[PDB]
Amino acid sequence: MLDFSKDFLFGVATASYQVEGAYNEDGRTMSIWDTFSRQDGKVYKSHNGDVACDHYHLYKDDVKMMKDLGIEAYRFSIAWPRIFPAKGQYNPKGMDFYKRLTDELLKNDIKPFATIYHWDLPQWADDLGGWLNREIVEWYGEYAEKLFSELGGYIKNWITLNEPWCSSFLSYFIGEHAPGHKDLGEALLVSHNLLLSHGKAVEIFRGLNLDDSKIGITLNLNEVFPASDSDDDKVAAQIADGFQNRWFLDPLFKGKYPQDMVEYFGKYAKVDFINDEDLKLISQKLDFLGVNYYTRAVVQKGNDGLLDAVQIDPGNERTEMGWEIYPESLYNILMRLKREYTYDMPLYITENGAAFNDVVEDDGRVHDEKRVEFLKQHFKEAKRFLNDGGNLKGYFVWSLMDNFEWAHGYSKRFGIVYVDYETEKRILKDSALWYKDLISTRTI
Ligand code: NA
Ligand code: NA
Ligand code: NA
Ligand code: NA
Ligand code: NA
């Protein structure tokens, strides 16, 4: 009778630096993204998160807004520079924000899902080497354990890292994200230290044996298609798939980096950070996996160089990011996890959503019909996965509101709610009204 059971969580997601603002208040010190956004050329028109959506001050209105939509769960991140503004220096005022945030959520029947690290590493940590310095495993563990002990009565669903592929390859190899290095060997080592920090937090978490509390990790995953049936394109797809997906799925869920990628990367950089003890910590059992899904890739062999597959445009509709709208890969990825990696483990879609050219019309409304159709198509694939025996527990739309989209600044709008940044006014887009109906009827 219900496409989505009463227990299925309809959610929305944000991230601290993208929405909070109040960047220099109540003891907060700079993150690497504060620093990076002030370096010339790194962020669209030198946008930064100084103010963002001012959600730090407006959080009560934002929670009321979610309550009126019937939101059942809210994924947010916790800002490390608020909690430890300096090495070893706990800031109770920073903790107080997350207590009053999560108190507000619970009192409005919204379940909190907290992301421990969503890219806003404290500048003091990066000055000590950041994710390149293996000591970060201990700094992160100290941070996580403080959150578990202070917030464990408030939060029962924890995510160690958001999208470690971005924090490693996009930040240290491609250089689009903070801190903006361009060195494959660095990005490979960072990926390992991120995964090792993840394992440290899981170890600490299990030792607390908190009542009714779950821990997992969030991975951005795609599906890679070869442009043709040639052997050239099949190897290209295999490499692209190992680069995005298997490089993280395999150590976490198989206890082993993917050997084809280890050999491929080893032709270009050192891969000597791999060892048995680290992989055992990395692959500790999780309670759930969070899946961030947006699009697929169609790839063709490039010119034999490092990760130089040519991106094929198959000619289909795309978002403002240039990302193809291909809802079937949401089903294919969830099925692939079920058949190859996570099996019967609970799965959450921790991000899915789209950037479109949103405009407030003369009627004061945002008629974002393309986003309505986008979300409708992807929720239909989630329902199909559930009806085929998939263990999907919830679905978080990215994002609750338009926000600071990293190197794109405020020029990409992902919200189901529009933010007029001059006034900080919230305007429900038609997609939020559609989502409200979906939560109410649980029918699609
Ligand atoms: Na901010
Ligand atoms: Na700036
Ligand atoms: Na696991
Ligand atoms: Na679980
Ligand atoms: Na499709």
Side-chain angles (χ1 to χ4, degrees):
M1 296 315 323
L2 297 186
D3 290 345
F4 297 92
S5 77
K6 288 318 271 143
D7 294 311
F8 183 93
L9 297 177
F10 288 109
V12 291
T14 66
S16 48
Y17 194 64
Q18 300 188 255
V19 300
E20 280 180 2
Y23 83 106
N24 61 0
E25 286 176 50
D26 295 329
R28 190 182 170 279
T29 56
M30 314 276 267
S31 78
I32 58 175
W33 269 93
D34 299 75
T35 303
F36 189 63
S37 61
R38 287 168 168 76
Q39 297 174 34
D40 298 24
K42 296 311 187 187
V43 174
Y44 180 84
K45 274 143 154 73
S46 309
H47 292 183
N48 58 48
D50 284 6
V51 178
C53 309
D54 197 28
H55 169 75
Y56 184 89
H57 299 115
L58 296 179
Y59 80 84
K60 286 183 59 68
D61 287 331
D62 289 339
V63 175
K64 192 171 155 167
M65 171 160 81
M66 296 188 265
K67 192 259 294 169
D68 289 337
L69 292 176
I71 295 303
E72 296 163 339
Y74 176 56
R75 175 178 178 238
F76 62 98
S77 79
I78 301 179
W80 199 337
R82 286 193 197 284
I83 310 303
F84 288 91
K87 186 171 196 299
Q89 187 186 110
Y90 176 56
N91 177 25
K93 288 207 244 293
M95 194 51 84
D96 286 346
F97 172 68
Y98 294 103
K99 285 175 177 181
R100 71 178 166 265
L101 173 64
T102 55
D103 189 49
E104 198 86 14
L105 291 172
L106 292 170
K107 285 171 169 170
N108 284 278
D109 314 304
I110 304 167
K111 190 158 323 206
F113 276 64
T115 305
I116 293 174
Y117 180 73
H118 201 134
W119 307 352
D120 48 341
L121 182 69
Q123 191 59 51
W124 65 256
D126 199 56
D127 293 350
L128 295 178
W131 293 110
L132 283 168
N133 183 353
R134 192 186 168 100
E135 268 224 62
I136 196 158
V137 174
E138 290 305 309
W139 310 339
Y140 179 81
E142 178 179 348
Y143 166 52
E145 167 161 26
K146 180 58 87 176
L147 298 185
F148 298 150
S149 63
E150 290 295 323
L151 291 169
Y154 298 77
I155 298 160
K156 305 302 174 175
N157 292 281
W158 296 92
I159 300 161
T160 54
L161 309 174
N162 177 75
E163 298 193 340
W165 184 93
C166 295
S167 295
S168 56
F169 294 112
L170 198 53
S171 298
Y172 282 87
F173 175 45
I174 294 141
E176 180 181 346
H177 285 184
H181 299 193
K182 302 174 136 223
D183 183 303
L184 175 66
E186 291 186 0
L188 291 172
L189 175 58
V190 163
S191 77
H192 185 78
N193 287 342
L194 284 158
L195 286 184
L196 210 41
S197 300
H198 159 78
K200 179 55 58 175
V202 171
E203 173 169 289
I204 291 156
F205 184 80
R206 298 302 187 207
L208 286 166
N209 193 77
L210 297 184
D211 282 358
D212 217 60
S213 192
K214 305 167 197 149
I215 194 156
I217 191 176
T218 282
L219 298 181
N220 52 323
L221 300 173
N222 71 4
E223 184 178 22
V224 174
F225 293 72
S228 80
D229 59 11
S230 73
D231 199 87
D232 280 353
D233 292 350
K234 141 183 154 183
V235 174
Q238 153 195 354
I239 298 278
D241 179 64
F243 178 52
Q244 182 66 47
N245 305 307
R246 295 187 290 112
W247 187 258
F248 291 97
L249 287 170
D250 279 34
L252 287 168
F253 297 112
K254 306 294 186 191
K256 183 143 145 73
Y257 286 100
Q259 190 50 41
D260 68 317
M261 299 306 311
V262 167
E263 289 174 10
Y264 175 87
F265 286 140
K267 293 186 294 109
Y268 304 97
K270 259 189 306 182
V271 296
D272 46 31
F273 53 79
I274 299 172
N275 62 75
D276 291 354
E277 293 80 20
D278 284 0
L279 270 300
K280 184 270 289 163
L281 199 72
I282 290 172
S283 56
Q284 283 175 91
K285 189 62 53 173
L286 300 182
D287 295 312
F288 64 88
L289 173 62
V291 178
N292 293 2
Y293 171 72
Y294 292 90
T295 195
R296 64 152 173 188
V298 188
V299 303
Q300 159 177 282
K301 185 180 180 292
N303 265 320
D304 279 315
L306 175 52
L307 303 147
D308 65 349
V310 173
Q311 303 305 125
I312 298 325
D313 179 3
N316 301 319
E317 292 290 308
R318 295 189 296 184
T319 77
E320 289 306 331
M321 301 298 293
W323 299 346
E324 182 185 0
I325 302 161
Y326 192 77
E328 244 179 77
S329 284
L330 193 258
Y331 176 96
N332 297 343
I333 290 164
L334 298 173
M335 254 320 164
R336 178 182 186 190
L337 293 168
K338 178 175 158 65
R339 305 233 172 271
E340 294 182 12
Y341 286 99
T342 57
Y343 306 113
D344 301 313
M345 179 181 309
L347 298 179
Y348 293 89
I349 297 156
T350 44
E351 297 185 14
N352 169 254
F356 291 105
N357 192 14
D358 297 313
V359 48
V360 184
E361 293 184 14
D362 298 325
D363 65 1
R365 297 279 298 270
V366 178
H367 298 303
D368 61 334
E369 202 26 72
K370 295 190 181 313
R371 185 171 295 98
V372 171
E373 292 310 293
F374 180 100
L375 291 172
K376 177 189 316 178
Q377 279 185 300
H378 285 83
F379 273 96
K380 282 181 182 159
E381 297 295 327
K383 170 187 167 171
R384 194 163 62 92
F385 179 64
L386 277 167
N387 286 347
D388 294 351
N391 196 12
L392 183 68
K393 294 302 193 199
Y395 190 135
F396 298 84
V397 173
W398 186 267
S399 184
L400 170 58
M401 61 182 69
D402 298 336
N403 61 51
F404 176 83
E405 182 49 36
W406 303 117
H408 299 274
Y410 299 98
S411 72
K412 306 291 190 186
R413 287 190 179 266
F414 273 92
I416 59 169
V417 176
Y418 183 99
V419 178
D420 177 344
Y421 291 110
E422 187 182 29
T423 58
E424 291 296 7
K425 190 177 192 169
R426 279 75 164 124
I427 303 169
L428 302 181
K429 312 181 177 173
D430 285 3
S431 52
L433 303 180
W434 173 89
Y435 201 33
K436 174 181 170 69
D437 174 90
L438 172 58
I439 302 175
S440 187
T441 64
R442 318 187 85 75
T443 303
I444 194 161

